[model samples]
Target: SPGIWQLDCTHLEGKVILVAVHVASGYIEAEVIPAETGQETAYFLLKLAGRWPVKTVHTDNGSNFTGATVRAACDWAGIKQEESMNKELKKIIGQVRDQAEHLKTAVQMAVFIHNHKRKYSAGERIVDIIATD
Candidate 1:
């Protein structure tokens, strides 16, 4: 299936959080990377594409998202890259508190709760929808 995803990087406790939010389903995929460099961002995008058929990705025009490496990765995956949007990404990830001993754990739990608890337009959980997909 063709899907549009919103990708972004945020900082928490001095660590970088790479987030991919599925636009239609409200499904979130997040990971903590060592740096916010274009290399890391591109790597994450490729990894996400491996799991799902990401057709179009929308992100802010940060160098990390617009750099040659990221563009190459998207090209390799046959994915179209677009720019614009920060408030909605922030809003979706806003409630994640940094209470875990590891930043990865906190981010993982946040994603878990979001997918399991959040309902879609048809009243199905995000994870459930993804499972059926």
Candidate 2:
């Protein structure tokens, strides 16, 4: 909650993968969606809400995240949405390069690795922080 939450959708093998990152903790959540629409992004955000306390969300000027549906969902959840893409997210996402045919599992495994194996500057894993919190 202290740092801006980052969200972005990256495409590989023609598959759309939605990713959300907590800038402070480096915790990541990702999933493959059928399409890059407002409805899909809103539903993904709602899913994230159920998993963590989302206060603010930041993304680029992508049409998918700027539509009415995403804004409505953010309003309903009291989440202030911002626009901009942080370079760290792209760097984080760059580690994943699995074949698109295995996208679902690839995303799951990639997220798990980042959340549980990767560490922050203080040498604390993302999952460790979430566990203690």
Candidate 3:
């Protein structure tokens, strides 16, 4: 089965940091935090995992992913962590001045649609699959 996924925020900046978990089983947990770093990431990981069983976590090769706090958390949880160096492509539209706001709203809408409108498989929304599980 595919591993669980989480967002690492060591490189993130701005007033709010967003994290998302793309579960192999099709569930997701999203959160917005004040800063992006190993400590914050570890905290969120623990919080989310406490609500569900997590065996593996995948994230970008950011400092948070490689940091001591995150590593220790993963070790304590017995979760194998994977890191990537690729940039994520987000489908965005609008001007540079409005980029941040646009991205925020876009992500929110995308998640909402993914949960309520879009299909996971042939015709399954994430919310539907999660509810089913």
Candidate 4:
């Protein structure tokens, strides 16, 4: 991605889960994205931005990923005061067992499911899933 840093804000496996995965590392910073969505969502939206160094946000969802809410919310939150809000999210994220280990677990689970997602006697080299640049 030309510009991407933050990641994940909806449904890890079909639930509204927000997590910032350090794309370059098996390290993660995650928070539960709001249960609902709208203007005030800007607050939590900004939390993700300011809490980390966000040059950009990347998602492989392609069509499913909508940048509108973030742009609108971020454009909106970008106007908020310096005092900031939602210290709770910070605590919740920091409360994670170990961020690096946290992501490692996700990687492990994904790897397991992927290899075992299905097995076919006629198994062939994968290709359709990849989105080449």
- All candidates' TM-scores? 0.76, 0.74, 0.57, 0.38
lDDT of 4 by residue, 15-36 (tens): 3545554333323444444453
Candidate 2's error at 66, in angstroms?
Answer: 3.2
Better of 1 and 3 by TM-score: 1
The TM-score that candidate 3 achieves is 0.57
Over 4 Å off, model 1: 83-99, 118-133
Best by TM-score: 1
Candidate 2 local lDDT, 9-70, one digit each (tens):
87766888888887777677789899999999999988987777778888775888678898
In candidate 1, where is summed lDDT lowest over 10 consecutive residues?
A: 83-92
Q: Give one clash count per candidate, in the order shown.
A: 0, 0, 1, 1
Q: Between 3 and 4, whose lDDT is larger?
A: 3
Cα lDDT of candidate 1 equals 0.73
Give model 3 RMSD, 1 decimal. Answer: 5.4
Query: How does residue 28 of candidate 2 score in lDDT?
Result: 75
lDDT digits (tens) for residues 1-133 of candidate 3: 4346665442223444444555553434545555777888888888767765677777776766788898899888878876121122122112222534644554454444344433343125333544565
